[PDB]
Assembly symmetry: C2
Homo-oligomer: 181 residues x 2
């Protein structure tokens, strides 16, 4: 039987969240600014297809996010999000978007000034999980040397990195318009 490639046998991987939380908590401000989605694994919840540009502002307690790009129907779209600590005190963040749902998000690795590797995972009641991974860049392109760092990080928690698909970015994108939305 065929199932989607983002439904995978087994339980979500462990991820040493307490380590990452302690490393990231004092650096929150540095995570703010603009991040471009360089690539992601197949994700049925993402409404923005191309030129995905995420603007993060940090208010000391959470990040407010303005995500923009071209939707699957070819129109420009702006979505409003928030990233805040998980409400039960677990050492991870919730990413929540307006008119959507919220999901756990771990920053598996970032150097803050070039790239970030992101990960979210959900267990089902029937012996499978679904995970969603992103590679984020501070610019429209990202050098092979940083892509490999994410690839290693994902490979290490057992994610099939052949699942990554590159997002359209670059001078074909109307970034100046997107920022006015």
């Amino acid at each position: 039987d065929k199932i989607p490639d983002f439904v995978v046998p087994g339980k979500c991987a462990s991820v040493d969240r307490n380590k990452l939380w302690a490393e990231q908590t004092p650096n929150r401000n540095s995570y703010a600014g603009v991040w471009y989605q360089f690539a992601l694994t197949n994700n049925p919840y993402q409404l923005i297809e191309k030129c995905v540009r995420n603007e993060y502002s940090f208010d000391g307690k959470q990040f407010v996010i303005e995500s923009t790009g071209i939707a699957y129907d070819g129109n420009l779209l702006k979505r409003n999000g928030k990233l805040y600590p998980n409400p039960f005190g677990e050492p991870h963040l919730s990413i929540d978007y307006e008119n959507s749902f919220a999901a756990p998000l771990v920053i598996l690795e970032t150097d803050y000034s070039n790239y970030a590797c992101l990960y979210s995972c959900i267990d089902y009641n029937f012996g499978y999980h679904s995970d969603f991974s992103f590679i984020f860049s501070r610019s429209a392109n990202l050098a092979d040397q940083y892509v490999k760092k994410c690839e290693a990080a994902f490979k290490n928690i057992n994610v099939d990195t052949t699942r990554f698909v590159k997002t359209v970015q670059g001078s074909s994108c109307p970034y100046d318009t997107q920022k006015t939305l």
Copy 2:
């Protein structure tokens, strides 16, 4: 051949503002114990049988302790919260430990006997998944109340033939559950 909980089209419009206006003043009456009477197929629900949800309202949100028999036959406790949607939208978020948070609308409730609850998420490919529940204040629920819920789901075009009854009653260790 897709799961019966992946449905064509966009999530339904549900008159959330009308609901919110009704329920806001009555939040305290929504606390206490609610049994899951029936639900549509849900892959995120870890508790299979004897599902008992205890709600406490602290003024801003509800704190939830959900208990019952897991799919492996063991007893399970899950901690949840229910709070206003953080963007200011007129609905609630239901959020469970080591899970995710989803929008939750109470389509109808009389507080003393039943509640009909609904959650919907849209996909980028033109389909949605919705999850529906019938809650009761007792292990059983009279027919007249089930029917009110069936009417409310029908009104939003949910196919009520998707509902399955949850095991409750004699076979359940509620006394032990209360203890977890």
